[PDB]
C-alpha cells in the first residue's frame, strides 16, 4: 500500500480522534468516531491475509453497533432536552445507552470478546495503534460526562474487565492476545476511578500508553509474536530481553517502578471516598496479570531456552531501521515514580 495513502489514513484516524476531543457538539463527536473507524479499517488490513480480513470484519461490526447505540443515546437525550452540547446528559436511559456504547468501543467486559481476536489477527504495528491510540476518544467522552456516570454500572464493568483480563491472560501463549488481555485489565483499572477523579484516569492512561508503546516496540525490534519465538531473543539481543523483563515487571505493578504509580494513586482516590472493598479486590486480581507477566519473563529473560543453528547467521547482521523514542519510552516506563507529584499538572 502506497506510503502517501498510509500517511493520509493515519492522519485521518488521528484527525477523527482530535475532532472527538475538541468538539462541543454531539453530532461532531459522532462524526469524529465515524471518521476514525472509516480510516482505521484499512490500516488493520495493510498486510492482506484471511486473518486480517477476519479481524477487520469483527472490528467493523463491533464499532458499527457501538456507533448505532451512541447515536440512539444522543437522539434520546435530544428528545428529552433540546440540547446538543456534551454535558450532564439529562436522561438516564440515554445515559445507560451511552455508557454501554462507549464500553463496547473501549472493550470493557462483557463487551471484551473482540479485543483479543482483533489484536491477534493484525500485525504488531496495527496492534500498537489499536491498543494505544484508539482508547483516547471514548475515554475523553467518558471523562466529559462523568457527572452522570451511574457508579454501579461503570464499576461493575470495570471490576468485570479486571477479572476477565487477569483470567484470560493466564491461558495465552501468543503475545498479541496477552497484550489484549492486559489492555482489558488496564481499561478496567482506568474506568474504575472515573466517577471519582478523571485526573487519575488520565494519569493511568498515560502510564499505560507509555508501557504499551515500550512493550510493542520491543516486540517489533525482536520480531516475535509467540512465547517460543521470544525465547530465542537472548541469543541475539540479550539487552533487549533484559529491558523487556524490566518493562514487564513495571507493567506488573511492582514498586518502585512506574506501573505502581497509577494503581497506587487510584487506590488512594477510592479510599478518599469510602470504597474500601473494591480497591482490595482490584489489587488481588491484578496479581493474575503480574503472574502471567512473570511467566513471560521466565521464558524470555530469566532462563536461557534452546536455540537453533541458523541463528549464527543472524549474529552477523544489525538492525536496518531503529525505532526512535524506544529508549525514552523504556525510561519513562520504568524510572518515573519519584516524579509522582507532577500529576498535579494534569488537572
Amino acid at each position: 500500500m502506497n506510503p502517501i495513502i498510509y500517511t493520509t489514513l493515519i492522519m485521518t484516524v488521528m484527525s477523527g480522534t482530535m475532532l472527538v476531543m475538541i468538539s462541543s457538539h454531539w453530532l461532531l463527536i459522532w462524526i469524529g468516531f465515524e471518521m476514525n473507524l472509516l480510516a482505521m479499517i484499512p490500516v488493520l488490513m495493510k498486510n492482506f491475509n484471511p486473518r486480517a480480513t477476519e479481524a477487520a470484519t469483527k472490528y467493523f461490526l463491533t464499532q458499527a453497533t457501538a456507533s448505532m447505540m451512541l447515536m440512539m443515546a444522543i437522539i434520546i437525550n435530544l428528545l428529552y432536552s433540546g440540547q446538543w452540547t456534551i454535558t450532564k446528559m439529562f436522561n438516564p436511559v440515554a445515559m445507560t445507552m451511552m455508557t454501554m456504547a462507549l464500553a463496547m468501543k473501549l472493550g470493557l467486559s462483557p463487551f471484551h470478546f473482540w479485543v483479543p481476536e482483533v489484536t491477534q489477527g493484525i500485525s504488531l504495528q496495527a496492534g500498537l495503534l489499536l491498543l494505544t491510540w484508539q482508547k483516547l476518544a471514548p475515554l475523553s467522552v467518558l471523562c466529559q460526562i462523568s457527572q452522570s456516570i451511574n457508579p454501579n454500572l461503570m464499576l461493575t464493568m470495570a471490576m468485570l474487565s479486571i477479572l476477565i483480563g487477569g483470567w484470560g491472560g493466564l491461558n495465552q501463549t501468543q503475545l498479541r492476545k496477552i497484550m489484549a488481555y492486559s489492555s482489558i485489565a488496564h481499561m478496567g483499572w482506568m474506568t474504575a476511578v472515573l466517577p471519582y477523579n478523571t485526573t487519575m484516569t488520565i494519569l493511568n492512561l498515560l502510564i499505560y500508553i507509555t508501557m504499551t508503546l515500550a512493550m510493542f516496540m520491543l516486540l517489533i525490534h525482536s520480531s516475535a509474536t509467540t512465547t517460543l519465538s521470544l525465547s530465542h531473543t537472548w541469543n541475539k539481543m540479550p539487552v533487549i530481553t533484559s529491558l523487556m523483563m524490566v518493562t514487564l515487571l513495571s507493567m506488573g505493578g511492582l514498586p518502585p517502578l512506574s506501573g505502581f504509580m497509577p494503581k497506587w494513586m487510584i487506590i488512594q482516590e477510592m479510599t478518599k471516598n469510602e470504597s474500601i472493598i473494591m480497591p482490595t479486590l482490584m489489587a488481588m486480581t491484578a496479581l493474575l496479570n503480574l503472574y502471567f507477566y512473570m511467566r513471560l519473563a521466565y521464558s524470555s529473560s530469566l532462563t536461557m531456552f534452546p536455540s537453533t543453528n541458523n541463528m549464527k547467521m543472524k549474529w552477523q547482521f544489525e538492525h536496518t531501521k531503529q525505532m526512535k523514542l524506544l529508549p525514552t519510552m523504556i525510561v519513562l516506563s520504568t524510572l518515573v515514580l519519584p516524579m509522582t507529584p507532577a500529576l498535579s499538572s494534569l488537572n
Binding site: I267, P279, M284
Partner: protein
C-alpha cells in the same frame, strides 16, 4: 543519613567501571568502608530518635539492623565470588548490582520516617531478590521458589497498602512521630478487626508465621548463597521492624486479636522444630530452624511488653548472624560434593578440622548457649511469656530441648563418624572460607561483650 545512602549509589558506578579482574576487590573494600561508616549510628540517645531530616530518622532499633545489613554485604560478596568464577564480566557486574540495590533499598527501608515510603521500599526489596533467585539459582525449582516468594509477599502486602492509605485519610498523617504522639485506641469493631488484620498480615507473612511459611524453605533452598544469606539475615527482620512500628496504633484490639497468632506461633514453634529432626537436606533444616526462631520473635512482639521487645530485637540480630553463618558453612560442603544431602559427606572433622570448629561454634550459638546474645534474646522472651502466662514455659522448654537436639544432630551427622570412602575431592579449606566464617562469628561474641547495643529502644 545521606552519608551512608550516597556511598552505595557510588558503589554502583564504581562496580560498573572497574576493570574485569578487580570488581570483587573494589566492591569488598568499599562495602567494608561503608559498614565502618554506618557503625556511627550506634550512638543512640535515651529518650527520642535521631531525626536527621524530614524523611529519614534512626532509633536504637533500626541502627543495629542497618549495621547488620552493611556488614552482610561484604560477606555476601566474598561467598558469591567463588561459584561465579566462570561467569562473564557483565553478568558478574549485574549480580553485584543486584546486591548493591538490595542493600540500598534495605538501608532506606529501615530509616524511612513515614509508612508509605517504608512500604514502597519494603516492596522494592522484592525485585532484586527475585531476580537473584530465579536467574542465578542452580536447580529447576528456582522458578517455583521465586513465584511462591513473590506471591506470598504481595498477597499479604497489598491489603497493607489499602489500610495505610485509609489510615492516612482518616488521621491525616503517616509519619511515625505524629502517629505515635497522636495515637488513639482502636474500638472493638468488625471494621477495626479487618483494619488490624490488614496492618498485621503483611508482616506476619514476612516473618513468616507458621501456616504462611511454605515459601521460605523453597526460596532459601533454591537460592544462591548470597540470596540465602540476605533472606535469612535481613529480609526476615523486615516483618519484625514493621510489626514493632505499626503495633503502636493497633491497641487495645491486639489484647484479643493476638490470640490466634500466638497459638500459631507457639505450637508451630514445636512443629517446625520437629521437622528439623527428620530433614534429609541441610539447607531445609536451616530454613526450618529460622522459621521456629521467627515464631519466637512473633510471640515476643504480640505479647507487647518491654522485656519482650528487648528480647525480640536481640533475637533478630542473633538469628541473622547465626543463620548466615550456617548457610555459608553448608555451602562450603555443597561446593565440595555438589549435593545437599546431609548423610552423603560424613566425618568431615577428620579432613577439615578448622571448618569443624566453625561448625561447632555455629551450632553452639544456634542452640542458645549462654552468654550469647541468642540466649539473651530467647531468655528475655521466655520471661516475658511467663509473665504473660505461666503455662507457656512448657512449650518454650520443649522448643529449647528440640532445638539442642536437631542442632547437635546436624553437627554429629556432618562432622563426626567416619568419612565416606568414595568421596576423594575434598580439598583443604581456602583462606576465603575461613575468613568468611571468622567474620561471621567474631561480631557475635564481641556483641555479647556489649549487649545494650542490640537490645532496642525499650532498654
Amino acid at each position: 543519613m545521606l552519608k551512608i545512602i550516597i556511598p552505595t549509589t557510588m558503589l554502583l558506578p564504581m562496580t560498573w567501571m572497574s576493570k574485569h579482574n578487580m570488581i570483587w576487590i573494589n566492591a569488598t573494600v568499599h562495602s567494608l568502608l561503608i559498614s565502618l561508616i554506618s557503625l556511627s549510628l550506634l550512638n543512640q540517645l535515651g529518650e527520642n530518635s535521631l531525626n536527621f531530616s524530614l524523611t529519614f530518622f534512626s532509633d536504637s532499633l533500626s541502627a543495629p539492623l542497618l549495621v547488620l545489613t552493611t556488614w552482610l554485604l561484604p560477606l555476601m560478596l566474598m561467598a558469591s565470588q567463588s561459584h561465579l568464577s566462570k561467569e562473564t564480566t557483565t553478568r558478574k557486574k549485574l549480580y553485584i548490582t543486584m546486591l548493591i540495590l538490595l542493600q540500598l533499598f534495605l538501608i532506606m527501608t529501615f530509616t524511612a520516617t513515614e509508612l508509605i515510603l517504608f512500604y514502597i521500599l519494603f516492596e522494592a526489596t522484592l525485585v532484586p531478590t527475585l531476580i537473584i533467585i530465579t536467574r542465578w539459582g542452580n536447580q529447576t525449582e528456582r522458578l517455583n521458589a521465586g513465584l511462591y516468594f513473590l506471591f506470598y509477599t504481595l498477597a499479604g502486602s497489598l491489603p497493607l497498602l489499602v489500610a495505610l492509605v485509609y489510615i492516612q485519610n482518616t488521621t491525616g498523617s503517616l509519619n511515625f512521630l505524629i502517629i505515635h504522639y497522636w495515637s488513639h485506641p482502636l474500638s472493638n469493631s468488625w471494621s477495626n478487626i479487618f483494619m488490624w488484620l490488614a496492618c498485621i498480615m503483611a508482616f506476619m507473612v514476612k516473618m513468616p508465621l507458621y501456616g504462611l511459611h511454605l515459601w521460605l524453605p523453597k526460596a532459601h533452598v533454591e537460592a544462591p548463597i548470597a540470596g540465602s544469606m540476605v533472606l535469612a539475615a535481613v529480609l526476615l527482620k523486615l516483618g519484625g521492624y514493621g510489626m514493632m512500628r505499626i503495633t503502636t496504633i493497633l491497641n487495645p484490639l491486639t489484647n484479643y486479636m493476638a490470640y490466634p497468632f500466638l497459638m500459631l506461633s507457639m505450637w508451630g514453634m514445636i512443629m517446625t522444630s520437629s521437622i528439623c529432626l527428620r530433614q534429609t537436606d541441610l539447607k531445609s533444616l536451616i530454613a526450618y530452624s529460622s522459621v521456629s526462631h521467627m515464631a519466637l520473635v512473633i510471640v515476643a512482639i504480640m505479647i507487647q511488653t518491654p522485656w519482650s521487645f528487648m528480647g525480640a530485637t536481640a533475637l533478630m540480630i542473633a538469628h541473622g548472624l547465626t543463620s548466615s553463618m550456617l548457610f555459608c558453612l553448608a555451602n562450603t560442603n555443597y561446593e565440595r560434593v555438589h549435593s545437599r544431602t546431609m548423610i552423603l559427606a560424613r566425618g568431615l572433622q577428620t579432613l577439615l578440622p578448622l571448618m569443624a570448629t566453625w561448625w561447632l561454634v555455629a551450632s553452639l550459638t544456634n542452640l542458645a548457649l549462654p552468654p550469647s546474645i541468642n540466649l539473651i534474646g530467647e531468655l528475655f522472651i521466655i520471661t516475658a511469656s511467663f509473665s504473660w502466662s505461666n503455662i507457656t514455659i512448657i512449650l518454650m522448654g520443649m522448643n529449647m530441648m528440640i532445638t539442642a537436639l536437631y542442632s547437635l544432630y546436624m553437627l554429629i551427622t556432618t562432622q563426626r563418624g567416619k568419612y565416606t570412602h568414595h568421596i576423594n575431592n575434598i580439598k583443604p579449606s581456602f583462606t576465603r572460607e575461613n575468613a568468611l566464617m571468622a567474620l561471621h562469628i567474631l561480631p557475635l561474641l564481641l556483641l555479647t561483650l556489649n549487649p545494650k547495643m542490640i537490645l532496642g529502644p525499650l532498654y
